[PDB]
């Protein structure tokens, strides 16, 4: 499965997963592209974070979605 | 060269300037309202918001608004800029409701920093809104 | 325990919960109320904003409470 990844600027990234990919999963081939540690990521989809463990499947994430990327911090 | 960020937040509220799209609000929101943003553009880009959609309103615009409100902590750097905050929030409002008195009671929620010359501004300037 | 939400929209609602109630047990009482879910719900009280798992006895939230609830963005 062919998705696409949004960054919070513009810049986009295609990564072929499937429907029983962990989210946790494409994290790390996101890391591997970029250089972003998985501990600072965020992927955000129709206003929603993506809880980790789950997979693409869960969210119905079909083919040629684009993924909401973000850089979630601590708070206070 | 921090510059060329100005050219593009520039054009762009120029670009979809009369059209009230999706793709506006949609990475325009979390630029202000995701989870913490460099001052650089998270002012900016959401004063252009306004500039927009100066007229009409909504209140995911708000609830969004306001989560950044929170995770702007003075952790960057000292400069002034609750100019720009309190010119958008407050443009952002015009009906009546005591809408603005709810907003107030927000920033009261949480803790209370440098903010509060802010409770004051607003909180004083305001339709009655008493007994 | 009876305790009242106020949403930053404009609403009040009332919930029966106890002293011995996880923030996260709050927020489904809440999606069963309306609709919006857990992942998007921001509880905020005379201190700040409410984690996922502690009580409302450790916030000290006694009854006729207001929290301020703030809805983290649309979520389909």
């Known amino acids: ?76 | 060269d921090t510059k060329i960020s100005s050219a593009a937040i520039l054009g762009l509220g120029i670009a979809f300037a009369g059209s009230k799209n999706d793709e506006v609000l949609g990475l325009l929101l979390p630029i202000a309202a995701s989870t913490d943003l460099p001052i650089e553009t998270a002012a900016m880009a959401s004063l252009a918001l306004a500039h927009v959609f100066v007229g009409t309103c909504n209140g995911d615009i708000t609830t969004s608004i306001m989560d950044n409100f929170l995770e702007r902590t003075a952790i960057e750097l000292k400069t002034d800029w609750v100019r720009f905050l309190a010119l958008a929030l407050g443009i952002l409002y015009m009906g009546q409701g005591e809408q603005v008195d709810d907003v107030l009671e927000t920033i009261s929620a949480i803790e209370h920093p440098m903010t509060s010359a802010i409770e004051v501004l607003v909180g004083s300037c305001a339709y009655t809104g008493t007994g």
Not at chain 1, 19 to 42: F, H, M, Y
Not at chain 1, 64 to 70: D, I, K, N, P, R
């Open chain 1, 1 to 76: 499965m062919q998705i696409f990844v949004k960054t919070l600027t513009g810049k986009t990234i295609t990564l072929e997963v499937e429907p029983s990919d962990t989210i946790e999963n494409v994290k790390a081939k996101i890391q591997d592209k970029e250089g972003i540690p998985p501990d600072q990521q965020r992927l955000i989809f129709a206003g929603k974070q993506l809880e980790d463990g789950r997979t693409l499947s869960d969210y119905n994430i079909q083919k040629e979605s684009t993924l909401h990327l973000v850089l979630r911090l601590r708070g206070g």
